[PDB]
Ligand binder design. Structure first.
Ligand code: FAD
Ligand code: FAD
Ligand code: NDP
Ligand code: NDP
Ligand code: GCG
Ligand code: GCG
Lengths: 490, 491
């Protein structure tokens, strides 16, 4: 029956940021609930969230590992000699090293709870019993035994999202990214299903660690993966993945998966094509985890798509009840959940209300090679603006003149409103893209124009200087129509 | 008896600035342009050539070599991510690095030749350019002003763009020492090398020699004062010192060669001013570069020099002599390739375009391709604190994600923002760590737009990256109030 200013359900990026800020910035008394104290099966997420446990952090460590496939090969062009027949990619070591670093992070979030006054952690399954009462139970089952009942002036829902699995016969023989982080052996043959972040990122991880003779296949339901990203870059990353041995199967989708007696899976596509692989990893979206919160108990409204409905300020239709992060289905990124939670605490317990700006958010795909993007792609720009200019550069980076990776083109594109030169979006493909694009995120907060980029003096030699070397559009959109040249003087 | 070839513009020096000027004058302004340089491809005897220091013996081959050098770390760091391979078979083949670099530089030389052959109104002259009088450039067989005149060119306008050259101290035995020029052509990697100087070139090459040295090798860098890389952020100077050490380079501070003798085995015996001594296979002087003014015969026309030996120019790159201009390293303003380019483009716009324009030498982003690299743009805190009553410093120093597993725990990434605390305006940003050169580029655009610390903070991080740390700091680590460093503003 313990009372708190704030009760947070979900010890993830959004929930921890809100919880820590309320206790430390504002002197509030804070309870935070989550289902597990460190990573891995059975509940996968845990203290620190999807980011720490089965998301940004282990994914980034494992893509970093996969990049060495390239490094070891490209080294030879710079006079490095070693016994190439002795190279092996040890997946068990990768996974163990990742486990240990993730476990360190979990214990350091445990450390934070223990060392911070008015910030308490409760292990279990939180749901809403009423307006001001969060119940903590033993399991996801609402009929399981009660562990605690926390009362709450304010309740924050930050339970994140969960892999979506299509309802096909045999889906129980497939995995999601959760299980991918713990496979005991790397698959010899693997199908990644989906053309978005997770499928592309993991396709590159499995590509580097595959045993001899192995093959990664990614399949996508439509023509061209990475819908929503810059189109030249969709095409170019498709090519660069293909050049590193990944087969991109377009216009295909599994209809049925069968278990072979030897443990492999027999996939039938809606087309009637079939393929045998060791692992089928489903990466077709993540959905809000609303189901276990018993939201009917208090009437918190959901969106048609299943997200907790919130206003600009993260408020539900129930006063004193809030939702942030992936549970809201708005932008599913760690940094945004964070900014959301920090803005919610500042609003509830602070001076002035704050809302998170979901426009011009810079983000990245840690594919090999990686993507960095901030702002509008050109087909979206072309519907909002009469005149759009596109500046485009695509070049072999300096080192890939001699590394042997001739296929590794860097792509830089800037999209403007051509009527005033205002930059609307920047899109980058190639090593460094995630790092380069960060400060570009800042430039878009400052009403940057194309001439603000081209009049800035280059840093040489970098890939990034190409962003500041583009003066003349490559093509335009006028009234929605793509054209090499402007028709008229206006 | 017969007419000289006549140009709107004669450029002496086919390097970063002079080519940008020449190409722009010919192609944007329809001018008839001559550009003179002493060699058509890289290497001894003259080292720079068509394409400049940049292409031949600077930015381009340097960066290819530092990129080579980084595989020493990659090969070692890959173990932590489960890569396995026979450690005892690894060998760094310098001769192959150099041959690969040579071919890449030669293809760039060749593409510049083709640029001349293909662009009408743009001509190349091989030889040594000097000013015979105020509208006459002569192209001679050698740097000796008494050598035969190959061509006498009529010039309405004359651009001086001959760059800089390594400075060598007047010590006994200086003839046994090399500069960065010879470093690019060493037939074998040196076992033991002293790099003299604590600036860009000593530090970049120390990491190159470090990766490629044969077994039992040692790279020593000496610097004359207490802390290398003066003019850079102090936290960074100290952190880069620690990281060079941690990678096996030995840093001798407060030391300076007084003389060098040849040992009987061909090695060098260096004696320092302090009376200390060191034997090495190569002594590489990297103690600065000075403007290359001597061969131009500037006395023929009265072009004035600064007290420091740069050609003196106004803000638009004009000398005291009408129709004679100077851009790039020979002006001694900022010695960087994109600066020289920006000056050449600005100068041509001013002279042939309709559009008077000057280069802004403040807030220029630049990088040191050390291992780990540095990226920086704008003012260091101690400079800021002399011109602003209240400066805030925002500092973050952290072990990047990957180095919790790579084995390279010494690899801290440092990110610093220097502000005018009275309105939040960012004065300088200083980065140390992999990716810094790449990150800083768009930061350069940020300062051009007068970003404040709040615009950085308000911007949503890209996660996980090093860069996002720049967008995650809201609270000064400390301040300068009237020049005085202190943790807390006086209440
Ligand atoms: C494979 C993968 C890679 C990703 N990589 C990146 C990336 O590189 N960069 C980036 O920005 N984003 C990345 N993301 C997205 C990012 O992980 C999320 O957007 C982010 O973690 C959302 O934070 P959150 O606070 O909304 O929820 P989460 O971080 O999901 O935390 C919610 C917590 O609530 C707990 N929980 C759920 N129900 C209950 C309950 N009833 N009671 C108690 N606790 C409960 C869970 O255990 C979980 O720990 C990735 C996601 C995935 C799956
Ligand atoms: C080892 C090294 C590494 C460097 N790395 C970088 C880096 O990573 N980034 C960066 O920005 N900067 C770097 N720099 C600096 C950059 O190279 C210079 O700032 C830039 O080349 C200057 O351009 P410039 O046109 O003034 O002169 P230059 O490029 O030096 O061109 C001068 C040209 O004039 C020719 N010439 C000289 N005298 C005559 C004569 N009288 N007649 C005819 N021709 C003549 C020379 O042969 C030369 O080709 C580096 C420099 C060095 C030495
Ligand atoms: N580096 C980062 O920032 C990362 C962020 N994340 C976050 O998590 C979110 C979810 O990741 P992810 O799983 O890759 O989701 P995405 O929404 O990014 O990708 C889903 C992919 O599956 C396809 N798809 C959707 N529905 C079906 C279906 N019923 N059958 C077959 N295919 C389908 C989509 O195709 P279509 O285009 O046709 O709809 C798309 O190609 C990401 O969008 C991102 O916000 C995850 C990983 C990395
Ligand atoms: N990545 C890039 O941008 C690069 C750019 N460059 C450009 O070319 C310029 C020249 O490079 P570099 O040769 O490294 O010159 P720098 O001016 O950068 O450094 C020279 C070093 O030698 C010391 N020094 C100066 N005079 C003497 C002397 N008489 N005896 C002993 N030591 C002395 C200086 O110390 P002190 O502190 O005492 O003055 C300094 O440590 C750079 O400054 C830069 O503009 C070159 C390489 C890479
Ligand atoms: N804001 C952080 C980003 C780190 C981050 O995103 N952490 C995630 C977990 S992966 C998160 O959900 N954070 C919200 C949270 O935990 N909030 C409660 C505490 C908030 C205030 N605590 C200080 C925050 C600033 N610094 C850090 O949090 C220190 N770094 C980290 O927490 C992470 C742990 S995974 N390290 C890194 O991200 C490594 C540094 C760099 N990003 C890289 O990628 O190399 C920063 O940029 O400093
Ligand atoms: N923005 C260019 C700058 C390249 C550059 O700075 N080159 C130096 C010589 S190393 C220079 O002095 N340039 C002046 C010059 O030559 N001016 C006259 C012609 C320019 C007009 N043409 C515009 C086309 C611009 N493209 C190039 O000049 C082709 N670049 C290159 O060949 C350089 C090596 S010289 N490659 C790179 O720089 C690699 C791309 C990226 N910078 C990276 O480093 O990976 C770039 O990023 O490539």
């Amino acid at each position: 029956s313990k009372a708190f200013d704030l009760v947070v359900i979900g010890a993830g990026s959004g929930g921890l940021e809100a919880g820590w800020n309320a206790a430390t910035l504002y002197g509030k008394r804070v309870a935070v609930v989550d289902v597990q104290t460190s990573h891995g099966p059975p509940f996968y997420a845990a203290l620190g969230g999807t980011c720490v446990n089965v998301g940004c952090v282990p994914k980034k460590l494992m893509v970093t590992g996969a990049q060495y496939m390239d490094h070891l090969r490209e080294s030879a062009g710079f006079g490095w000699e070693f016994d190439g027949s002795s190279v092996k990619a040890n997946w068990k070591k990768l996974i163990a090293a990742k486990n240990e670093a993730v476990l360190d992070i979990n214990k350091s979030y445990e450390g934070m709870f223990n060392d911070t006054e008015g910030l308490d952690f409760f292990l279990g399954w939180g749901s809403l019993e009423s307006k001001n009462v969060v119940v903590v139970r033993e399991t996801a089952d609402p009929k399981s035994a009660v562990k605690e009942r926390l009362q709450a002036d304010h309740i924050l829902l930050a339970t994140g999202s969960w892999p979506q699995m299509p309802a096909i016969p045999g889906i129980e023989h497939c995995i999601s990214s959760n299980e991918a982080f713990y496979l005991p052996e790397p698959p010899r043959r693997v199908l990644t299903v989906g053309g978005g972040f997770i499928s592309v990122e993991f396709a590159g991880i499995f590509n580097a660690y595959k045993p001899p003779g192995g093959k990664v296949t990614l399949c996508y339901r439509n023509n061209l993966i990475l819908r929503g990203f810059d189109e030249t870059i969709r095409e170019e990353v498709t090519k660069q993945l293909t050049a590193n041995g990944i087969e991109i199967m377009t216009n295909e989708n599994p209809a049925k998966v069968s278990l072979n007696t030897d443990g492999s899976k027999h996939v039938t596509f809606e087309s009637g094509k079939t393929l045998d692989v060791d692992v089928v990893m489903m990466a077709i979206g993540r959905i809000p985890r609303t189901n276990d919160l018993q939201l009917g108990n208090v009437g918190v409204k959901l969106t048609p798509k299943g997200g907790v409905q919130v206003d600009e300020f993260s408020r539900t239709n129930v006063p004193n009840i809030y939702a942030i992060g992936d549970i809201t289905d708005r932008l599913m990124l760690t940094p945004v959940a964070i900014n959301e939670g920090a803005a919610l605490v500042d609003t509830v317990f602070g001076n002035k209300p704050r809302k998170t700006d979901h426009t011009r958010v810079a983000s990245a795909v840690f594919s090999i090679p990686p993507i960095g993007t901030c702002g509008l792609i050109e087909e979206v720009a072309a519907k909002e603006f009469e005149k759009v200019a596109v500046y485009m550069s695509s070049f072999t980076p300096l080192m890939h003149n001699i590394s042997g990776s001739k296929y590794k083109k860097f792509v830089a594109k800037i999209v403007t409103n051509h009527s005033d030169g205002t930059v609307l979006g920047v899109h980058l493909l190639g090593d460094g893209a995630p790092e380069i694009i960060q400060a570009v995120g800042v430039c878009l907060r400052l009403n940057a124009k194309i001439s603000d980029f081209y009049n800035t003096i280059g840093v040489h030699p970098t890939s990034a200087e190409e962003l500041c070397s583009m003066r003349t559009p490559s093509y335009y959109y006028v009234k929605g129509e793509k054209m090499e040249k402007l028709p008229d003087s206006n």
